[PDB]
Scaffold this active site. Structure first.
Site, short mmCIF file in Angstrom:
data_model
loop_
_atom_site.label_atom_id
_atom_site.label_comp_id
_atom_site.label_asym_id
_atom_site.label_seq_id
_atom_site.Cartn_x
_atom_site.Cartn_y
_atom_site.Cartn_z
N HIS A 1 -5.25 -5.39 3.28
CA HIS A 1 -4.46 -5.70 4.47
C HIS A 1 -4.41 -4.51 5.42
O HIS A 1 -3.58 -4.49 6.34
CB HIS A 1 -3.04 -6.14 4.08
CG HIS A 1 -2.99 -7.44 3.34
ND1 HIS A 1 -3.20 -7.54 1.98
CD2 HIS A 1 -2.76 -8.71 3.77
CE1 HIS A 1 -3.10 -8.80 1.61
NE2 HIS A 1 -2.83 -9.53 2.67
S1 FES Z 1 -3.60 -2.75 2.44
FE1 FES Z 1 -2.62 -4.48 1.50
S2 FES Z 1 -2.92 -4.15 -0.66
FE2 FES Z 1 -3.52 -2.26 0.29
#
Ligand code: FES
Ligand code: CDL
Ligand code: PC1
Ligand code: PC1
Ligand code: 3PE
Ligand code: 3PE
Ligand code: 3PE
Ligand code: 3PE
Ligand code: HEC
Ligand code: HEM
Ligand code: HEM
Ligand code: HEM
Ligand code: HEM
Lengths: 380, 240, 77, 164, 52, 60, 380, 54
Positions: free
Chosen positions: D129
């Site tokens: 993410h």
């Molecule tokens: S950026 Fe979402 S799990 Fe690491």
């Protein structure tokens, strides 16, 4: 002489449940999906029995056994792809079953609806551990994601995730216990389906008009036997065109690699039917809030029969709630697509608005609109 | 020949239903296995982490884990290399494959000494009788090289040199290292290796016996209480 | 619950014909296309516009994601 | 009635005690086994870590990143404030040894392992993410709720580090 | 909603307060006995011995 | 002076909630008491053979 | 206000089946064995679920997995020995169930008796494949011996044996498919037991007198509830005194060795019920004859409802047939001992005489004893 | 262990015994197993063709 069909005990049970059952004469194709779900369960039981017949649950040999099934076993690739696409189309028919329940006012059967909600929880858990089973890259990482999702609970979560893991990460003990759980759970699903049908037969069956069907009924045989047989054959056309023509539009290519704990995929997603819950949990920026959002979002199904604030059962005479219901289906499609796409602008705000609209519609807008339609048709 | 000699019933210290194992004898038998029996036989299922809490302390078990060497890897070149063993490792195998054992021990494969007590008829009695029963063959039968007569071994010809004798090793607690003592120690240590759940299982059994000896009179009392309506019920027939 | 008695019906006469004596596809096209078109007219305005909004914000989200992928010339020196 | 219900009470106490023990037997059987508790203590990392590089090993069953840090990296970590991040933490209070930093590479949004030697902050870049992390694992640009956990290690003589 | 808001239902509820509280106490002590809750079982003097 | 079964029935065994409460409290205390007694019986039977019996010559 | 137990449909079924079931007040301790069989089935299901949670079915890792269960899994030794001794207890209670039916004439309930015979066959298959599962010397060699027994059938024996083996020997395919069948088959046993209980519940239970029990009938609660609780407690006493003091008195020593295909054991002995079957097999000195002897020896239980020629249902009032029945139990014991013993003198002739006496005493001698008793009671 | 001319039942021989020696000999990057690269890459044969000709 006597009538064997209605005097022999197993025969009279089968006759009273499936043969001479008084069914509504006007139920559409949306009522076939219960038998479609049952035949899905039977097909998955048989195909998975063959897959576990030729499958070994060990992290060194899970992918090797999957390859052996795909290549060496006679039609083992057909059995494996039949199992995968059968699970996907089982979830399609589950979603259409649930959609029929919300649309045609079938949630007034309180016990039947609650048994259906428990069945839904059971089948999502079962297919989650089944997707864990082939020990792919995305398979192992999705297992880690959902276990951390359960670990979001405070003061209980870390012990519970170490208990489910059988250790401190997804490993051989986790894979073996998930194989056992995925094997056993469809039979619990079958028993709960027996309870489902018993409650349904006690309370009778519903019609699309939402009225009393007792004035005009027909026996289940031969009308609905041949109707559901037509449904079974259309079922099989769709299932085998998925199996034999487009096998990989519902799967994930990252599932076709050995599970590397050191390497992380750059875009991680669960399989397509978890996408709306994954989207709403990604929308809410809190672990505890996200996991409660997921559980309560599935639990709105069971909470829904207390929200029926209309004197009209089905939506088939209630066009404002028809508009709201199709907006709800549209929002579910939005949530599926948002769970598919990663976390950038504007997917965050689209998923947040989608989840907020979903909850506000299914808790607030439908009962207020039902009150509005009652005042519109001058019920009081 | 077709005959077999049944080993007798030795009065072990753990023969009773509630009698545990003698852990001093267990660790003495571990020493007997380590500098006597580990040259040929293997133990694929007993580890130093099993040795902790039964045989030795954690530090002593760790130290005897670094006294051996274990293959591990891969290194940065992708090659196997030697490293000192730790508490998580198993007992080191003398041969990599059974064919090396066949080549070294004249066509005879020493079986794994991890379930030998649960695997042979009689168990630790069989192990003790086999180890203490070495004698010259009777007049008339002949055995070729590498084969030795033993009454308790089926077929009466075992491929094993007499493994233990008086003062074959030195103990740590000052126990005299006579051949019968060494045989008894290795027999009870093999019994522990074949059943590490012995003492815990017998404690579980004692608890189970006490609770069921308390619960059977009480549950029988409930059954007779609930059934006393019927068992003292009286009938009468009063026709006109 | 049982098929013998479910409801009270009076003065209702039902006429039915034999399946081997009547056709299985009677006017399947001439009386079939107007019926499905009438059903589409009845239930087209409550179903289609939400999915139109799905398609519109689908394209909008794809366009915004691709524009976020695209850089800007705010870096001249 | 007191005698009869006393018999009933004692036997249901015994039954409840036995049921508690056997259910605990089952639950402890589904828990971690002796071997996976034995490999809960990781092996020796030695001194094979290159200069400015990171290595990912299996410590406590999970991916552990042991990374070498430079003097400039230590100066930047000291220059980074405590309360300027999402949570109050400092590099000196995070890692005792400034030459080598050992952390558990699990991100704080979905529990992914970040890809080493990436990101705009010079640390790691978890792309599930999109969370960037510094040399100490502090979250500066990303959707992660918390920071990266640093395992409680111990340092023997200079070639021996005990992590578990 | 307004069905269970009245003096008769209030006095029924008040009659059932001690029984509901007793059943909650039973549930609490059964929960801590089954799960071996340390935070509650480090206070009763006898059961303190086994935890050491 | 009332008999102790009559006192037990009047105080605890009459109401079902109090019955369950004294069942659970007795379950906890009886589990402790029999754990202590059963282990004590075990080490008295197996004195000089258990690992904690022979442990004192190897830690120190 | 209404009765929820007699109104709610699931509660109505439970009330009519297990709570307010009209049961005969005089049934002996031999009638607890149905509930004991159900409880042992539940115990076996749970225990095997945990075993397969910690078990991998692969020829390289089956023995290592069982050893890992016994050693490193917390209380997995208790789980594994509980499973084995619970299978032994299941067969003890099953033979006592069959003997109760034989002695009290319960085989007149023909449908229930035939469903029970199918249950007995399913339990034999389940236990055989489960004993194959730990991959010991006895497991592999008993599997080969019983599969060659299947190969004794003419013109299809080799094809069915190569189909069952998944190859040309007991190998990895055989082990994995036996794992799948052994896991799944007790759920079919549970469904057939539900059918068993339904067929019994049609006509009610039987009394030891063999008379009409409608004269003095009592509810199943709390009388037989607490009686079955006491029986469950006594069965648990025997089961776990076996488990915690003599876990290997019914097992085999050389089964604890890894399965070497080249090496062979000096003797072949499965468990004691299969020793009975093995003695009936090897009494007759040809392959197809022995196979038909074993199959016929199991099907004579289903054949016996047609063999009842006496005018008295139970053996309570017929003393000659009691002598015949205990002679039958006597050479059940004798045939079990002969199946234990190797095939040399005089065990060969003793087993032949025992088998011919067994078949004669069931087929031709008990109807003669019944008609002699009817003649002596002036009933003929 | 010995050498033997491989029969039909033997699989294709690995050029490297373990993946870490492959990583060392191939300058860090590990050449993946191309037994499911088409089913494991987004695009499949199109991706393989474009990767080789691009
Ligand atoms: S950026 Fe979402 S799990 Fe690491
Ligand atoms: C002998 C001395 C005592 C004596 O004479 O008692 C008389 C008494 C008989 O009294 P009765 O008045 O003639 O008959 C009424 C019964 O007492 C009424 O009770 P019951 O005996 O019919 O009870 C049914 C049966 C129920 O038993 C079962 O359900 C057992 C099921 C079979 C065993 C488990 C399966 C596995 C078997 C593997 C082999 O329970 C028993 O048999 C009692 C078990 C007692 C256990 C020990 C208690 C201390 O004898 C017994 O009860 C025998 C057992 C206890 C001794
Ligand atoms: C098997 C032996 C026990 C059988 C059940 C039994 O005797 O129940 C007693 C009785 C019912 O049988 P009863 O018929 O003896 O009930 C009499 C009850 N009094 C004395 C109040 C009139 O059960 C109970 O009262 C409740 C039992 C459960 C208690 C709460 C749970 C405790 C553990 C929590 C975790
Ligand atoms: C039921 C909810 C409470 C459970 C609980 O706290 O149990 C305490 C007992 C013992 O509590 P404890 O005080 O030993 O610590 C458990 C909490 N950790 C380890 C995170 C500090 O915990 C359990 O039994 C675990 C239950 C997991 C589900
Ligand atoms: C789907 C596409 C549209 C299908 C369609 O034709 O919908 C219109 C149809 C109208 O049917 P009706 O209102 O009964 O009109 C009869 C009047 N003579 O309306 C219907 O058929 C209504 C029932 C549709 C059921 C399927 C659509 C919803 C599927 C997703 C439901 C998800 C629920 C939540 C799941 C996660 C939790
Ligand atoms: C063991 C000895 C049991 C015993 O004592 O049996 C005698 C008993 C007599 O009971 P009965 O004659 O019915 O009268 C009771 C009081 N008048 O008889 C009974 O209680 C009847 C017992 C019937 C069941 C006996 C089962 C024994 C084991 C049989 C295994 C093989 C069964 C067949 C398998 C194929
Ligand atoms: C019953 C099982 C019988 C059996 O053992 O079948 C195995 C056999 C294997 O056949 P195959 O894989 O071709 O091996 C070469 C030898 N025939 O399998 C066969 O020969 C194939 C058997 C096919 C049975 C088809 C049944 C059709 C029923 C249609 C109902 C409508
Ligand atoms: C005629 C006997 C007269 C006895 C009188 C005794 C005193 C009577 C007056 C006082 C009352 C005492 C109590 C009475 C209790 C009930 C009555 C009783 O016990 O009667 C005797 C009993 C039944 O008599 P009944 O059945 O008529 O005998 C026909 C002969 N077959 O019959 C018996 O007990 C005899 C049983 C003999 C069984 C012999 C079996 C031999 C073969 C066994 C083979 C087993 C399998 C071995 C392997 C075979 C293959 C190798
Ligand atoms: C190398 C000379 C060995 C020594 C030292 C020990 N054992 Fe032995 N063992 C060895 C061989 C070559 C064989 C197989 C010989 C044969 O004829 O099969 C064995 C076998 C055993 C057995 C199994 C006997 C049986 O009946 O199956 C046992 C119980 C056994 N060995 C015991 C044993 C013990 C306890 C030892 C330590 C004192 C020991 N052996 C040392 C080779 C060698
Ligand atoms: C998972 C496996 C399931 C099976 C095997 C199953 C089975 C069936 C069957 C055969 C029917 C009759 C067909 C019909 O009435 O249309 C039915 C109807 C019904 N199902 Fe399910 N179902 C399942 C899941 C669910 C779910 C997930 C829900 C709701 C969330 C649900 C709620 C209902 C309701 C309310 C009805 C009654 C509808 C009516 O009478 O018209 N069931 N089910
Ligand atoms: C008795 C019933 C079942 C058995 C024995 C069984 C067995 C198996 C086995 C052995 C696998 C591993 C093979 C593979 O991953 O391709 C698997 C995978 C899977 N199972 Fe099942 N299954 C059963 C029922 C179900 C049900 C009811 C569902 C869905 C609700 C389901 C969904 C899945 C899914 C999604 C996979 C993943 C397949 C893939 O991703 O390729 N299964 N199952
Ligand atoms: C294998 C699993 C089996 C289960 C779970 C089972 C279950 C039961 C149960 C719960 C009962 C009621 C208890 C009783 O009446 O004593 C019963 C009775 C009965 N069983 Fe079974 N049974 C099994 C096998 C068999 C077998 C192998 C036979 C016969 C060869 C059989 C024949 C009968 C008969 C005839 C009755 C009626 C008893 C009577 O009328 O008094 N069952 N069974
Ligand atoms: C859902 C039900 C069951 C499952 C999942 C299951 C599973 C298993 C597994 C995984 C094993 C191998 C583990 C080991 O032997 O160490 C095993 C062994 C075994 N099972 Fe089952 N089982 C079930 C029911 C039964 C039943 C109903 C019987 C007999 C009536 C039975 C008899 C056996 C036997 C005899 C063994 C071998 C024990 C030994 O060799 O000492 N099982 N079972």
């Amino acid at each position: 002489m006597t009538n064997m069909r209605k005097t022999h005990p197993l025969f009279k049970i089968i006759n009273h449940s499936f043969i001479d059952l008084p069914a509504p004469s006007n139920i559409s194709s949306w009522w076939n999906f219960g038998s479609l779900l049952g035949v899905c369960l039977m097909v998955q039981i048989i195909t998975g029995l063959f897959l576990a017949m030729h499958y070994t649950s060990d992290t060194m040999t899970a992918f090797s056994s999957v390859t052996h099934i795909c290549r060496d076993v006679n039609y083992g690739w057909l059995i494996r792809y039949m199992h995968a696409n059968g699970a996907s189309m089982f979830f399609i028919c589950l979603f259409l079953h649930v959609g029929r329940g919300l649309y045609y006012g079938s949630y007034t059967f309180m016990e039947t609806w609650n048994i259906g909600v428990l069945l839904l929880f059971a089948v999502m858990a079962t297919a989650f551990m089944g997707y864990v089973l082939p020990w792919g890259q995305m398979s192992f990482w999705g297992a880690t994601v959902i276990t951390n999702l359960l670990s979001a609970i405070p003061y209980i979560g870390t012990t519970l995730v170490e208990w489910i893991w059988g250790g401190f990460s997804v490993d051989k003990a986790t894979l073996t216990r998930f194989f056992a759980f995925h094997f056993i759970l469809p039979f619990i699903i079958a028993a709960l389906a027996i309870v489902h049908l018993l409650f349904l037969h006690e309370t009778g069956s519903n019609n699309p008009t939402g009225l009393n069907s007792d004035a005009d009924k027909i026996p289940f045989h031969p009308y609905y036997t041949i109707k559901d047989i037509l449904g079974i054959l259309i079922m099989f056309l769709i299932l085998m065109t998925l199996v034999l023509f487009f096998p990989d539009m519902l799967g994930d290519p990252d599932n076709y690699m050995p599970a590397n704990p050191l390497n992380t995929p750059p875009h991680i997603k669960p399989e397509w039917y978890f996408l709306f819950a994954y989207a709403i949990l990604r929308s809410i920026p809190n672990k505890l809030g996200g996991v409660l959002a997921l559980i309560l979002s599935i639990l709105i199904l069971a909470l829904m029969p207390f929200l029926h604030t209309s004197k009209q059962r089905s939506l088939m005479f209630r066009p404002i709630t028809q508009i709201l219901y199709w907006i709800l289906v549209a929002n579910l499609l939005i949530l599926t697509w948002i769970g598919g796409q990663p976390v950038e602008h504007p997917f965050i705000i689209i998923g947040q608005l989608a989840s907020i609209s979903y909850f506000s519609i299914i808790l607030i807008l439908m009962p207020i609109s039902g009150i509005i339609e009652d005042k519109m048709l001058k019920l009081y | 020949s077709d005959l077999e000699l049944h080993p007798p019933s030795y009065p072990w210290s753990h023969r009773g239903l509630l009698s545990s194992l003698d852990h001093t004898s267990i660790r003495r038998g571990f020493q007997v296995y380590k500098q006597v029996c580990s040259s040929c036989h293997s133990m694929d299922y007993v580890a130093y982490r099993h040795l902790v809490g039964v045989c030795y302390t954690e530090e002593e078990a760790k130290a005897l884990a670094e006294e051996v060497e274990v293959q591990d890897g891969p290194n940065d070149d992708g090659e196997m290399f030697m490293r000192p063993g730790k508490l998580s490792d198993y007992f080191p195998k003398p041969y990599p494959n059974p064919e090396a054992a066949r080549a070294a021990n004249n066509g005879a494969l020493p079986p794994d000494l991890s379930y030998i007590v649960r695997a042979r008829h009689g168990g630790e009695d069989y192990v003790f009788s086999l180890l203490t029963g070495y004698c010259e063959p009777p007049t008339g039968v002949s055995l070729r090289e590498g084969l030795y007569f033993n009454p308790y071994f089926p077929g009466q010809a075992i491929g094993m040199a007499p493994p233990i004798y008086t003062e074959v090793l030195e103990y740590d607690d000052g126990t005299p290292a006579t051949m019968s003592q060494v045989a008894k120690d290795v027999a009870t240590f093999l019994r522990w290796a074949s059943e590490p759940e012995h003492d815990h299982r017998k404690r579980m059994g004692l608890k189970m016996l006490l609770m069921m000896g308390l619960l059977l009179p009480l549950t029988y009392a409930m059954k007779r209480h609930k059934w006393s309506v019927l068992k003292s019920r009286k009938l009468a027939y009063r026709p006109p | 619950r049982e098929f013998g008695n479910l409801a009270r019906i009076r003065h209702v006469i039902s006429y039915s014909l034999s399946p081997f004596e009547q056709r299985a596809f009677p006017s399947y096209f001439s009386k079939g296309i107007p019926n499905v078109l009438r059903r589409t007219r009845e239930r087209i305005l409550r179903v289609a516009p939400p999915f139109v909004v799905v398609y519109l914000i689908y394209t909008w989200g794809n366009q915004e994601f691709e524009q976020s992928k695209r850089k800007n010339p705010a870096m001249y020196e | 009635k007191g005698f009869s219900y006393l018999v009933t009470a004692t036997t249901t106490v015994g039954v409840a005690y036995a049921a508690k023990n056997v259910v605990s037997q089952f639950v402890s059987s589904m828990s971690a086994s002796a071997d996976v508790l034995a490999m809960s203590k990781i092996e020796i990392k030695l001194s094979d870590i290159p200069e400015g590089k990171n290595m990912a090993f299996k410590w406590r069953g999970k991916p552990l990143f042991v990374r070498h840090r430079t003097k400039k990296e230590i100066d930047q970590e000291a220059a980074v404030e405590v309360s300027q991040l999402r949570d109050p933490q400092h590099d000196l209070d995070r890692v005792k040894k400034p030459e080598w930093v050992i952390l558990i590479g699990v991100c704080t949004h979905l529990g992914c392992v970040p890809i080493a030697n990436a990101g705009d902050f010079g640390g790691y870049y978890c792309p599930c993410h999109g969370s960037h992390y510094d040399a100490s694992g502090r979250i500066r640009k990303g959707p992660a709720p918390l920071n990266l956990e640093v395992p409680a290690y111990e340092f023997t003589s200079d070639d021996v580090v005990v992590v578990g | 909603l307004s069905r269970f808001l009245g003096p008769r239902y209030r006095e029924l509820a008040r009659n059932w307060i001690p029984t509901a509280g007793m059943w909650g106490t039973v549930g609490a002590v059964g929960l801590v006995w089954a799960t071996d809750w340390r935070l509650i079982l480090d206070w009763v003097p006898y059961i303190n011995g086994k935890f050491k | 002076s009332p008999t102790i079964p009559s006192r037990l029935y009047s105080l605890l065994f009459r109401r079902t909630s109090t019955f369950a409460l004294t069942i659970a409290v007795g379950a906890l205390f009886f589990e402790r008491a029999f754990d202590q007694g059963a282990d004590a019986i075990y080490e008295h039977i197996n004195e000089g053979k258990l690992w904690k019996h022979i442990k004192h010559k190897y830690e120190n």
